[PDB]
Amino acid sequence: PNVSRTIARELKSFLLEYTDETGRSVYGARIRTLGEMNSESLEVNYRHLAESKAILALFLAKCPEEMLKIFDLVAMEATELHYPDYARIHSEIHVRISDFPTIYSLRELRESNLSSLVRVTGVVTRRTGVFPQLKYVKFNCLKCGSILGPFFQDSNEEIRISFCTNCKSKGPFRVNGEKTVYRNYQRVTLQEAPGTVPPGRLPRHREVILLADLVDVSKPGEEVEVTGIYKNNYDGNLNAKNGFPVFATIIEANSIKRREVFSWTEEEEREFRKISRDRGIIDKIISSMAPSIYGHRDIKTAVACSLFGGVPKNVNGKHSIRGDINVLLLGDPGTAKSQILKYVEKTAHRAVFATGQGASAVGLTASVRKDPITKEWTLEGGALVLADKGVCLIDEFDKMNDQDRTSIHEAMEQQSISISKAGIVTTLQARCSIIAAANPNGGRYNSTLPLAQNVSLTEPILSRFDILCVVRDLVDEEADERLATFVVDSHVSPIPQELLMKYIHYARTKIYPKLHQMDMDKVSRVYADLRRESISTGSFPITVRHLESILRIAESFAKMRLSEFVSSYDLDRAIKVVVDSFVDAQKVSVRRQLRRSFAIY
Amino acid sequence: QHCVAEVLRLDPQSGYLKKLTNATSILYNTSLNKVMLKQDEEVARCHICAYIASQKMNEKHMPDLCYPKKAKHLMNLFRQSLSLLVKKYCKMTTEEIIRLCNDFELPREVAYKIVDEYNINASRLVCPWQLVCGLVLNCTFIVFNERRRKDPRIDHFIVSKMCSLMLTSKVDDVIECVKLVKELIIGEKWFRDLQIRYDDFDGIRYDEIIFRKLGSMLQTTNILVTDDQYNIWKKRIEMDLA
Amino acid sequence: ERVFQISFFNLPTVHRIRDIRSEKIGSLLSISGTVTRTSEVRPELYKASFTCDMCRAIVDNVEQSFKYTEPTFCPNPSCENRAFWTLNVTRSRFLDWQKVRIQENANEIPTGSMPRTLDVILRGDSVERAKPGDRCKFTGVEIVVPDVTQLGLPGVKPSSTLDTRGISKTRSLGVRDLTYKISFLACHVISIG
Amino acid sequence: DNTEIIKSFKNFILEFRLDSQFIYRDQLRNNILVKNYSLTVNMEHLIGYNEDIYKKLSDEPSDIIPLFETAITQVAKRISILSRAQSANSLPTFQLILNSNANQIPLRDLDSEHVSKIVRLSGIIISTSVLSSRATYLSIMCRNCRHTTSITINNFNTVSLPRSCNCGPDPYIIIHESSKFIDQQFLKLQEIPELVPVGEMPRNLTMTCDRYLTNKVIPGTRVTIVGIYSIYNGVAIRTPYIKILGIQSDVETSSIWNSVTMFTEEEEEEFLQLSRNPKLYEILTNSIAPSIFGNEDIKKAIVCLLMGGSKKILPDGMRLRGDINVLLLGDPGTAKSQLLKFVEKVSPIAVYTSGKGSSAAGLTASVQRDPMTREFYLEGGAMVLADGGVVCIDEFDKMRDEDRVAIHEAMEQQTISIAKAGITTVLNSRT
């Protein structure tokens, strides 16, 4: 229809003198921000102009791929009027829509709805490529050493020319890829939400195309709402169609979202410092660490020391000291063991939830792995590798073979991996914090034997663990009175974890608290005292490993408090943690150590 | 919008431009709206649209708007849906000699002046190639004096190009084609304007030739060379160690 | 603005897949079986326009079941070659489509036997009444479709070829091989069991 | 124009100086002696000297580069003739090599914009495929006309053979004995695994190089490179890649057994001063472990170990192990691990491993086959990567029998042998 004159003038009048509340020309802000940010897109809420007039939407529905025409050029006109030379820089502008009420599933699509506005739901998976494709074409002719003029490209065909400006010759033509201009084209898979598939039925799938410089705005495992158009695909080679002559379908999406980038602001570090320097945040940190279970505080504190990490240093590039902290839990499966580690995955930064065989993200190692797309060799690494600065979780540590154990051994030993396979030799940075778990032999821990004797683990990687916490059956009545009540209530002071993770993000970057050698020979005094007192009544000794680990814990608590340097009355906390970690890790013979080593309390 | 303006402002190669762009936009919109006008390569979908846009608004100029097989087809479909001197007594047109003058990339005012000369004095002719060739050669010599002066090689190259374009091996005839037209066109006011503009006056400046011919010895015959020449030449041997 | 569907249900007789022969072609016949798969809804070619390759003359007719390739008649017959044509997408009508895979039922199987299966196709608004992993009672007609999977098999193979006797002086033989399977169609289905 | 640019560029060659000394002039003079026909260039040096080339080379690099090539050729011709007149026919174009440190941009942040411009980035290397060749100057004869011609290609290692010099189409045969060619290779790249999303696999990209920019890199060597986002061949789509125009690599990543053997002269004086000092042994014993206590007896052995010993070859082939073998034995603490951790830092070319072989690290020759053509190639080994070097081990207790046999034989002859189905090997350990 040639109603384009009235349509254009009326939609431009809408764009210009739109007013909804307080005479608010909302789109002026949109356009001026577009000009400021050199943006290639602008959005228009469907609801308000639909309310004003609906035959706009009627003519859009009849042919929206044609309705786009007046809108893009009107956007260009508005952009030029307020931003001269924007036409010189940005060749063309695309548009976006929002607030469309019609709802279609991924299986509800019917022929009566195609070639009209379509709004779907699903999850983006199997993202592939940000490939370029043409939008302006010029050529390199052979019969004449000249070129072609600019030419916009349609949405559904290639281009090929047989004439020439000099003459009517169909000379060989080639595109000048070295001078043309391109845009963004993507192929994206889209699948229905498994959380609402009705009983018995299966979830269908589709395919999606993403354009308008909006590529790489999605990641697998996200709920999306793409609103756009719908049509078929005449991709040639269609004369070999057996059965009935039926064609596929593909969507062209305009609007994209991710609902259904953490950073610190000035007031946010102001409050961080305000609370850090005020009266021992540590008690509240342990209170708000993980409310998943009421549980117990000792391993919460151990893992709290694990979170923040310490401070690495070297004596002039030699004799390195590990800054990050390690942990290792163990106990009967009857209690919570695989809960708080997943909570830590959810709460921390650049954390990973890997596992052994079965229901695992990666095999905890690095290998020359294939890719489904065009056979792409890649060097993936275990969850340890991804968290070279961060932490890496594990559960069911016992369930490993030789090589997947030697890998974690190498990690905790030299903070570096090595590969000597497939014509490639390399090392990486494996300075990750480790968390793990395991299952004691027989369920119960067998209180009447030492650790290595009880569990069949090996010592060389067992040594690295500054903390080896353990619990057993808690048989008292109060255990029931608390745990059963809490669990049943699950179906009947602490600070937000968002603020906690933003705090750790703020802490790992700025503060590197020092420690002055003021009264620090007490370290040597107490170390020698307890190193003799170990032989006095026990079998196994205590080594300078624990000394260095207590120093790491001291600096970790310095970071935790966010104080300028070490505080004397927190070395007490660190020493007590290591002491009472060693207490439970021995035979009943250690019962004398209970009374003897309490002076350093 | 970029390509639309590119093609619309290709017509030269007040309200006209604005009304024409609006007409082209809405005409293309109407042609693409229905499913009745398909199999149409955009490669050339902004030519007769522009023709009918010119036809519509107020005024229409037949020439240089269609400037082919499918042109008429689309028009109907849309309008229903809605040597070189021995040759004797040769003929010429505007664009033939415009091309011959435009192979040098000379401006359009000079070409228009030559065309006016032709259409005024092409009645008693024997061979228009001679007059047009002389005209364009004496335009080149007058406008390109600077680069010819700084590079005496041009003289031979230009003469070879205009000897090969007219398919001849002898050149004294070209020399005649230059001097005769110089004799004929020697006293016209527009020629005067061109002379004062491009300051050839036989290839030498006015302020020098007056003293050259008046009978003085202060006339600057530049057997010597300018100071800046020496200043810029010194650099060549400054780096002679390499 | 008018497209129709029909169905016939509550037939008296039931035929298993093994109880179907070559004398029930194009004949209404009730079957019952099982489902093991579904397929993708893809709008099918009910009607579709074309255009002359030398003008805008549109034809809004369609050759629907098979032989979906070429119409002939042109409104302005003045054409050097009126044999072939062009196509169009918008001046057309479409209707839903769906494919499933039907399967034998356990309570009616013979000895030394696999659940012999075959493919059945749906149409129209009756779609969405299929279901994986269930027994159903189909009803329709014995549609058949081309295939080549049956090559390399014994016996002689039929082959089509246009005649060249009676008219003369006019692979040049244009020989097309024909060998067909026996699929099925469904006007109406119900969930049995 | 183009000649104003070519002159503004050629002035940069001979009329540029810093630290009161010519740099590129004498660099070219030395290169011509080396017979290199190339150079090195820093684009930071060009911003201050002249701004008439930076803002236009940024956006039209392919358009401006060949001009610089020809300018370099002209300078080369002048200096060649002048040098021949000074002391004591075929001078092809010189490749231009440059680098930069302005910034780095990751593959993730790329887009379909700034295509054909110049960009900077980082990554890791994988592929060393093949020395695929291209043509630069090849001669032609027509089969019927016997009409000789010639063709030369410049940078795109655009036009095809002539379609007509009756002879018909395709009238040309290609000579080889009088042609010329260069080498190139298809190189890959992929982002740093530590800076990636938690879930998805990484993405790689392909590149190409030319005569003297080849063979510079071996996989694993982290490199930063700068190139042009060029294109060649859904509905209508062309593949993206990058063309190399400048490569910088770490001086020496993971130890290369082909290391430096010609030291400078300025160090020799202090080397000999330390040699002639009578306190050498005490200095070494004091400094081999500055942050460590006691065990002077133990530390007094590492100095003997590192310097190897008496290599002695007899006319029977029974060589004596030039080096020595050591074994700590101790309880936790006592620095039994810290010394081993440190020793790699000091050692020039040596490897460190745990017991049983580390993650994807065969303690000895773990040979397998080729991903392409399924052929036999020796893969590697912790006992041969460090050929002519020391090896550090921990947790010597938990060995596999097969793993221990080979290392146990190395500890006495230092020559492993593998004689599996098809491959027969004598690969020297010497460690």
Ligand SMILES: Nc1ncnc2c1ncn2[C@@H]1O[C@H](COP(=O)(O)OP(=O)(O)O)[C@@H](O)[C@H]1O
């Ligand atoms: N104190 C508790 N409060 C709530 N749930 C608990 C508690 N202790 C155990 N559970 C439940 O019991 C399960 C114990 O599993 P777990 O022993 O961690 O398995 P695995 O040993 O294989 O990791 C957890 O998934 C958790 O939901």
Ligand SMILES: Nc1ncnc2c1ncn2[C@@H]1O[C@H](COP(=O)(O)OP(=O)(O)O)[C@@H](O)[C@H]1O
């Ligand atoms: N003899 C020593 N001198 C100085 N520091 C030591 C010594 N022994 C151990 N340490 C310290 O104790 C920690 C453990 O070192 P080491 O004994 O080498 O490993 P392990 O304790 O596993 O045997 C290291 O951080 C190291 O700094």
Ligand SMILES: [Zn+2]
């Ligand atoms: Zn041509």
Ligand SMILES: [Zn+2]
């Ligand atoms: Zn016709």
Ligand SMILES: [Zn+2]
């Ligand atoms: Zn020939």
